[PDB]
Amino acid sequence: DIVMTQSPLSLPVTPGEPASISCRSSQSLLYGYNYLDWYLQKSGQSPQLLIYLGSNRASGVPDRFSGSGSGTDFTLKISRVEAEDVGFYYCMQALQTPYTFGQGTKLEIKRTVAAPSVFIFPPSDEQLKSGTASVVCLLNNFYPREAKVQWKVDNALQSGNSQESVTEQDSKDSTYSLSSTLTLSKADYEKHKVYACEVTHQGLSSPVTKSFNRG
Amino acid sequence: EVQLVESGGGLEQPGGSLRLSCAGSGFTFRDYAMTWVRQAPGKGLEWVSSISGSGGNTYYASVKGRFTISRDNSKNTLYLQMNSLRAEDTAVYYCAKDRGLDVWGQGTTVTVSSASTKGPSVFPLAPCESTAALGCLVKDYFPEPVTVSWNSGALTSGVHTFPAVLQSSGLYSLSSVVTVPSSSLGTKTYTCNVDHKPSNTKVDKRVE
């Protein structure tokens, strides 16, 4: 097959600055007809055509995106990046079956530091009934992505009994959000009183703690 | 309005089979080559197969003698017969309009696994000062995906539906949350609308 080599793999950009992505093929794709396309896939969406046949923009794709190149060497440029541009960009050869794609480039948006708003949720009575307690902590709308969540139960530090998930960077405000779930048996839940989620983040002068008390 | 709508994804054990369909609207279906592309959980894009406008020519990636691409122009429908399923076949499969790939379906999920279908339990997330949060915890389901909207789709601002995490049990859990003005908390309704098609489970839960 034709190998498609794409770089960089990660592309941090502040809105209004340009961005460039290169794609190098292991064989010429000039059949002025270069069979190379550019696709973008935003979080949770299908891929969408940005450029086809090297340089031709898909129907509603704006001026600020362009494709150029010939032979084995191609470049997607975005002359001015917007927050909504966040996503993964892939090059693809349609010269020959099998169509093959680059490794993909993650375009990340840079913005100012933003402290999470933090919230703790108790387990529902509904849940408690079936014999399990999930306690949830939410860090809403923060930047940058690195954040530390520390669960505490009657002031004991927990480890090994939580899981965390992080949203993809928001396309409006370029923040992330994170949810961490502490899972305990109902029996354990009922042994202890004080449940706390402590959050450390760049935007926070000192760690923020949210808590509740089982009664 | 050119549109591709896929269905027929779901869960099967390895060696099993699944049929995917992709229905086209708003163009002459017969005039175009049609293509299947897949994306494995957390991976990039990978070409699977193509079929010409007439269905006279077919092309295949690893799928050679397991998968069959076909089309029925009379219904404007593309097909991917998937037999002898393997673990590596687990992915979101997109349909795309070909001879760039200018229009793509929404995708349909295919999971190949020893594990069986299980519908989720949905639990409210609510406080035990200007902004408040509420959510739904969608616990212990298999396979992916689940869909979550709020207020039947009327609430989209401040919603975050988190990636599911695989629990040690081998079942997924996810939360979906929205932040809202605290002052509205007495008078407005917040309802999460959860759908897990593989188990035919739908739940509307008004979170108080």
Residue numbers in the entry:
A (entry chain B): 1 to 31, 34 to 217
B (entry chain A): 1 to 61, 63 to 100, 111 to 139, 145 to 224
Paper text:
By engineering a small secondary structural element from the rabbit light chain constant domain into the human kappa light chain, we dramatically improved the crystallization of human Fabs and Fab:antigen complexes. Alignment of a human Fab structure onto a rabbit Fab showed that the longer FG loop present in human Kappa constant domains forms a bent and bulging conformation that would interfere with a beta sheet packing interaction. In the case of the FG loop, this consisted in replacing the septamer human sequence HQGLSSP (positions 198 to 204 according to Kabat numbering) between the structurally homologous T and V (position 197 and 205 respectively, according to Kabat numbering), with the pentamer rabbit sequence QGTTS (positions 199 to 203 according to Kabat numbering). The resulting mutant is shorter by two residues, with deletions of histidine at position 198 and proline at position 205, and is referred to here as ΔQGTTSΔ (positions 198 to 204 according to Kabat numbering).
